[PDB]
Symmetry: D2
Subunit: 255 residues, 4 copies
């Protein structure tokens, strides 16, 4: 059963989610006031009603809830891009990742979830304000067990050794190629997300310089179309998010 | 160090990978004969040469190697689609998944890797020939610790209870909606991959019938463009894989 | 030189266009009042200023100006789709086209421009209110020389014979296939625009029935991405119009 | 009726087209020998049979036939891109176009068709071998009435004045911006097709330099998806042509 201090997701009659901590306080919504105390001693799958009689269904928070409801500061990496980073670099339970910059911690949360409680993520960040926001998100999602933030400029070096992956979302990933070459295990991946084609060009210039340290690099971009499926009309949604950034992969190989 | 019986990835001078078991035998390539015995007692990152003097670099097999080099029978789910299944359903270490049909086991391998050694995948399959091929792939990748195959028609029922996700790649996923509703935990996901728009239509008809058992369903399709980045010319690759199948998600919610 | 009663395009300092008729009246803008009389006796390429001193440059109206500035009622066919209709059916100066329904006349204007003053477009329309709006657009663009509107339900028949193309944007183009087969010249095109995949399915069912009257049909959909090209960053625009409708072509062939 | 020396399209039972000149000779196909003399005195829509009894249906050649069946040398501009050039620049019957380089004449044929017999295209070309091939295509399609080829390097200047459009497919369109500014009518379009993002960047650098000569430039790229529509399965075709080149438009405006 659910206890005071536990987190839950409440789903309103419109399907909207609220990720809350269970306490003895009132929670205000546009559908009325909820007495959060009523959740104590209930089980997931049950429901409570607001003072206006609207039902809120109780679910266990999942990674999708934390990602969707986290506090956002610097531009987050979209789940579609995190998905392809994890898929094409083969990111796996138990991996050791160096990430930079932590930003809001959205990519950090996604990677931390995948690596599991015995994996490790060390995220570099130069902006101490952003690092504080990210750390609040990380603690909130319960991933302070496996994530550390370093307030260090990663262009100056990577301290960690025998790293499975170096995953980058910062302006000049070319400034990290040499450090990543040193830090990565044989067969580990360097991955960089970059909004601009200019950045892809600069990164590939640096990867060509370091050609004997990596397998052939690959750059992709991912588009996800939503479909509208009504009884009498299936068609793609009219508008889509067609660009976030390019993703470049290079697998480390010795000599 | 590497021992006889261990698996390794050998990378040839063109960057081509071979996923092999280390034994005392000759391994024939288009670049000459390798004495696999020479790998015994070496460490990852080292290399051996063929009888023609071509170097093969030694790497630890990762999930990407098993997925790329597995034996294929029935049409596999592409990594881009597996990536979005895992991302948008929040598939996580420790999850319990019911999958059908196992097919070649490509999606099974991807999901098994994500759920980790304490997660579980039960994959249903009606074709015993396909089930045998998939099981060989699963044992080969070392995931027989966490995957079971059931030779059962899933349209007749799901035996498992309190399942995190029901993940489908078969012709008529609408025939599984009612069973999945029963099997899924509150907040668990039903996910179905379907090549044809006709199938999406039939599935949504069934999900509308079961509207009080799920949150609003979402159907997507994912396109991944490769970029060609040469010193004097960056452009998308001329041709792309633009369609594999649609992916439909519906999260279980009670009443 | 420009005379009273002529149409001109005025381009403001932000690049915004106004398509106006030259008269002796004041024209109000957010950048001040223009004395349209000042345009009489000027030549294209010259400019006038508003009472606030903002310059408006004078250009000859082109088809792009009429299409961009026309009055819109029923949903117009987007220029990208009209472009592919004209390209893949080979629509040419001098052609005779039957169109339905006229709608706002956007597609009509595009086709009328391509066929030129010796071509002909007969556009069918059942809604007399829409037909009036379209006819105002057609007269405004000066294409009443080559376009006729028929207030007739095209599902009941096409009166015209030896037609180069039958071009459709209405809900049930399958109801026009038999009539188009009769009306079209050998080698002429039947073309239908349809937002929904369901409509494409119904249309292809009818085209299969009429397989001995047409070459193999082809259905496409067209996506146009805008690129943002700043000095330090080139990337696709973040959001795009990814779906308007499918376009189906079938070329008439006898027996 | 058809006369000796006329061109016709013959359509075989598989739907394949042959664009031929009618003479008294044998024409060999994989479906047998045709006696082209049998076409003399027939009308479009009729048919002839090969010596093996396979029927070939007779159609009047249209622009789509000439474009599809022309001789190709240097890489042609794809019809989808020509379509958007014509649509977004508003290319119209009677226009005067300067094009470079002529290449194989594919874009030339498309533009010549649109401008009609009273329009004019002057195409520049430095390779005399390519110019000869293009001119053969142009004469073959009957557009030598309205197209001229100049064996001149367009980077050295445009001789023509009061041009409606300058349309470019060559490596360094930035070298033509100043000449086009001089040659174009007020409101005329400069349009350039460029495969590489690097070229788009260089072109926009030059257009920024010439900002007071043009309206804000726009760069697009066009993707056309084919749909497979079978009775029991509609889906996009698996593979598509996703990249040919970017198209940049800038409309001329004085001062
Ligand atoms: C786009 S944000 C990262 C967003 C993050 N991927 C997420 O999903 O929330 C880029 C981050 O990189 C940080 N950064 C930039 N240069 C850095 C450097 N040299 N070392 C460490 N962090 C850096 C910035 O301060 C910023 O927080
Ligand atoms: C497209 S294959 C699955 C491919 C798989 N996702 C992969 O990545 O390798 C579809 C599989 O579903 C199996 N199948 C079809 N209907 C089924 C049913 N009712 N119960 C169990 N398996 C079924 C087929 O025999 C086949 O192996
Ligand atoms: C989507 S609007 C056409 C928009 C038009 N293509 C444009 O670009 O402005 C569809 C039009 O078809 C007309 N229509 C529907 N059924 C028709 C019929 N059977 N005969 C003639 N017009 C019809 C409708 O009244 C409407 O004006
Ligand atoms: C890609 S091809 C043009 C293909 C053409 N658009 C078609 O559809 O067939 C480029 C052409 O530009 C010509 N060219 C390159 N530089 C030129 C220049 N400065 N002046 C004239 N022609 C030039 C080349 O010789 C070549 O024939």
């Amino acid at each position: 059963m659910i206890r005071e201090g536990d987190k839950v997701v409440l789903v309103d009659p419109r399907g909207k989610r609220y990720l809350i901590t269970v306490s003895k306080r009132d929670f205000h919504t546009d559908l009325g006031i909820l007495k959060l105390e009523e959740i104590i001693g209930r089980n997931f799958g049950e429901a409570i009603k607001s003072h206006k009689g609207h039902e809120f269904k109780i679910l266990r928070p999942r990674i999708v809830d934390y990602l969707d409801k986290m506090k956002r500061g610097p531009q987050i990496v979209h789940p579609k891009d995190a998905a392809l980073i994890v898929a094409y670099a083969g990111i796996s339970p138990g991996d050791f990742i160096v990430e930079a910059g932590v930003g809001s911690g959205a990519l950090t949360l996604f990677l931390a979830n995948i690596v599991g409680p015995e994996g490790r993520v060390v995220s570099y960040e130069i902006r101490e304000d952003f690092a504080k926001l990210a750390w609040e998100n990380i603690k909130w999602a319960g991933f302070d067990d496996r994530v550390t933030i370093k307030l260090k400029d990663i262009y100056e070096g990577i301290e960690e050794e025998n790293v499975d992956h170096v995953i980058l979302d910062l302006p000049q990933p070319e400034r990290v190629v040499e450090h990543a070459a040193k830090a990565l295990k044989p067969g580990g991946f360097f991955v960089a997300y970059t909004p601009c084609s200019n950045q892809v060009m600069r990164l590939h210039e640096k990867l060509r310089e370091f050609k004997d340290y990596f397998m052939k690099p690959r750059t992709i971009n991912v588009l996800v179309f939503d479909q509208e499926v009504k009884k009498e009309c299936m068609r793609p949604r009219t508008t889509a998010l067609v660009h976030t950034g390019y993703i470049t992969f290079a697998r480390r190989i010795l000599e």
